[PDB]
Design a protein around this ligand. Sequence first.
Ligand SMILES: [Cu+2]
Ligand SMILES: [Cu+2]
Ligand code: NA
Ligand code: NA
Lengths: 620, 620
Amino acid sequence: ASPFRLASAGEISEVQGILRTAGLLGPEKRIAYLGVLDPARGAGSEAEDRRFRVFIHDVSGARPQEVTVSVTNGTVISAVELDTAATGELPVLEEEFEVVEQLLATDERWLKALAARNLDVSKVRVAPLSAGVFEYAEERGRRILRGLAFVQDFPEDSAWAHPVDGLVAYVDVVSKEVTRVIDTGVFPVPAEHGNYTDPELTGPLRTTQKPISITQPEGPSFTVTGGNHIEWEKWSLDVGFDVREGVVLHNIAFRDGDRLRPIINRASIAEMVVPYGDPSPIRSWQNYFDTGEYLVGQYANSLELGCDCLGDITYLSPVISDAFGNPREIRNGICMHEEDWGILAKHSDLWSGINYTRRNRRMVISFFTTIGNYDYGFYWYLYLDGTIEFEAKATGVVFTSAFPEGGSDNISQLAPGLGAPFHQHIFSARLDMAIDGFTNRVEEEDVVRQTMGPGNERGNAFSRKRTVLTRESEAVREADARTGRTWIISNPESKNRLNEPVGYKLHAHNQPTLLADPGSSIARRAAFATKDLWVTRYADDERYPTGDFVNQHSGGAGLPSYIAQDRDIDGQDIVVWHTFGLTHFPRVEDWPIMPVDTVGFKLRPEGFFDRSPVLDVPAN
Amino acid sequence: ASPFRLASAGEISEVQGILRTAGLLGPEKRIAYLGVLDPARGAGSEAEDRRFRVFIHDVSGARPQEVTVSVTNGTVISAVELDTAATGELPVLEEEFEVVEQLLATDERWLKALAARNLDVSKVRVAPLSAGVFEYAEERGRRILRGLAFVQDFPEDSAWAHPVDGLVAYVDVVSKEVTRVIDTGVFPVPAEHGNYTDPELTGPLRTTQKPISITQPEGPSFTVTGGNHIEWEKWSLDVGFDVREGVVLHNIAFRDGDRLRPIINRASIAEMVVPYGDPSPIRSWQNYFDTGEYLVGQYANSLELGCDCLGDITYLSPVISDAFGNPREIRNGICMHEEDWGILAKHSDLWSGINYTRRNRRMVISFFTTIGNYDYGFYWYLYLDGTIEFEAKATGVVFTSAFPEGGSDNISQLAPGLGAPFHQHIFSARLDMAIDGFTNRVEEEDVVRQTMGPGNERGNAFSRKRTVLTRESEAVREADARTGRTWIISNPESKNRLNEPVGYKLHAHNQPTLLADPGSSIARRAAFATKDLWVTRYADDERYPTGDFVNQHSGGAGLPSYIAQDRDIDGQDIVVWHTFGLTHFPRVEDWPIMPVDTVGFKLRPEGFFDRSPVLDVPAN
Ligand SMILES: [Cu+2]
Ligand SMILES: [Cu+2]
Ligand code: NA
Ligand code: NA
């Protein structure tokens, strides 16, 4: 009966029915986004109202709509026509992915370009790439995708090995017109294949790996009730799923003795962007907001046992809407398991004679998505000791180009004539905090060095300082690894037994933030990515650091607009937005398929508990 | 027959015999350090000569000696009398640990101090703490330990719960005299116990953890030959053990097709220091060089199966010398196992229809040591994809003090009246590099931001720069996390198929370095700890960043002295010394026994291979 339960097939079909009945979902309509809304603050006391938010596209060229439906009551709560030139285009539709290649294949300019390079049009794949917002006035108010070409020599060939540089096209996917074809000149199309299952490239497969068997003869240490409520080693949470954000954690809390103590109300990856650093006009417009533009949840993989998730795995199979409002299940789309995590605590004491060792474990909740060439694993970890961690695992095939004769400051070489433009993958974690409840504040904590002198005669002392972030205008912060900078979220009205406010400390990896010039389009559209930490006052309509409609949407929405309100965040219901990313200068080792690389963050208890929370963990 | 084999019991007894025969090991002599020396450069062609280095202490007050013995030939190579006031005292002896408490227990000043606090001398434990070098002229040339007191209420009590603040004593452990007893005033001795196996504190133990079974029905994927030569998934290395450094890796190489390609010649943790940041005179002298002063290898734990090391474990049981030259085995002191490491690479391709997933694994080589209150796990990892990683895991019981009435800028509160002084744990990894052989160089690589303008009209471009470190004077470097700074070790004479020098990139965690004022004693004695990266030209006598004799030794030796030679490091036999540490402001959660926290670094291949090295990893 939890209001945080996953959407069921029935609820989605019911949203479909309500929209149909209301005249909002005729044959020209397509659902670009559909997701359940979280319960309002203080809604637990009142009866439940399951509400769904829907973005409806119209293939005949009519304006799209944003609609909220109450599936409980069978009503339309609100329906509003969107002016996309102002507020943004809807997310890219699944069905639009083929359209770019299809339209280009009969366009005389495109055909001329391919003929100049002696490429068979039947073998040319075209990626359906988000367009962003640049200097082309005609694109304002139109759904545009840009196309980059890759040659596929045969059906099972990896087209990424054969980029067609010097060529890009722009297409209106509603009116089904090619608006521009730009050919800056021929580059050699790299010839080596990148087929990582071809024995000629792999060589003989290793026979040297012996089996590793991970089993649980009595089953897992966690329970699942109500479909998605997890209880494990004092932790309690609900595992949600949204087609945009993917796996979302709700109501993260820890049972400390008799009391269920909230820590985080909602945790999600609310945006992720992949900005490219190649100034060639063929790619200088390239910034993929995988979450906001493409919707990472919708492309979640079905995860196979013993391959993707190893051990005793409990799967969730989230349901999403197709383009017509019919439910579609992502079978085994979410993995849940616990795993051993080495030593938790250990001491062999000379004076007492007592030797003590305890093992750690973590609960893992994950999914894996595929966005064109990229594949990303999103992992949330809960540890016995109260630590919470996120990790992103980046793999797939690197996005390629030609490698210029004479080299490049912005592209690395992977194979003869084959380049990989420099880029970043930058995530925003939205952490709606609830440290012992909703009354929270954030402090920035720096190490403080001290000068040798009076009070510090041996020059050994060091200290720290904490600065409370009192209003949103003061709450846009940068990393300082040299001074060990962290951010503590505390509850000023909840004290531990030592009379100190309870808290959690966020530990960042301090990787570089967005590198683009601050005057670029991407610096405005991904403003969140320019700073490591933002704190806002909670509001129900402030969901994404980039706003609701990212596709072809200029600056104007998202975090810079939210913080302008300059709201009180000193002992209030607040939200932390942490930017973290990977800066990728591709290496030869990344080709032809990339080994996983990782980035993330964690939060550790900081005077939250009255002593170690794992004293009751048993031996062996 | 490997010259890198572990020392055997027989070799140690033979060193004993040779020293005895030579008149160097009479009844007043004690071995403070004994270890095998590595083979000289180019020694493989010539017959083997197993040589051992020995530091010999004399309990009658005579000068100690440094001796090198050839156990193969039964000879003394060299023997030299040490002037400890100049070059340093020998490492702390096991047998000296009891002496501080024993001497203090009959000293009238110490007894007066205990009586003022109503403490039973029979219940007062005294830690045998390294003294360092401060303002006490009488200590120069004498073996001094300083004592801090902790009350143990009964034999199985954790004395760390009951620090006796305001009191410190200094003792000459050779002449067996108490030189000073300093009592700055009484502080309350904290009363709560810290007994983490007492049910009253733990409460009822959890019954909610179900078993996790990790097995290998056909055994491990690695082989061990010659006692300590490991071969695993293309990697080759020898696992050494030294009483000072602990586990040392030799000859790390990777079999790429037909060629065994060297990467790292020797990897070790060559020093570790724990500087304290409390300006109280009771502790302001406190800096524990666990490696250099105490010898971490000698206190390696015997690791129990299913508790310390889980899965299919292969143990090494290294042999060390006791104080008289008799061999002593550390049973199951080194764990070796492989473990699953999640997804290695994954792509689901739209155009080819091919779905591909491969799993990662790592080889783990570890030990755990105990130094008083502290316990540290040292972990080396080798991954399928060519990555090499070190991780230190810090646990044990935090070093305590009183918590001052009215608080402290340099001490945190753990329990009523109980404090934990701020401190750091700072490691130095010595990496004798051999990237495709010995001709190596180091470049510092920074991300480079670019300005919007001509050549970068959209303001999206970003790049990087590499600066070769050509001589040792230019090779003392600091972190810059904001610019994504890393260091690449390459071989300028070995190119990959793309005509680029092969290399490995060192990725640091960019944690704060030594915080002490640069004019302090500790900044001079642990100079290495003030900077993140040092590069030297290889020399056989440049083993430790702090020199051979750290105990009570001023500045004068170690890294600052090595780099003054200003040797060529541009395409030469070089050594990288990476400083990395944890800055610890203890939390209530660290009490009464600390959950593990970690720090480390890794090196990843950077154009070392001609493409991904894991294309031949099989499915499932
Ligand atoms: Cu990348
Ligand atoms: Cu510590
Ligand atoms: Na909140
Ligand atoms: Na070297």
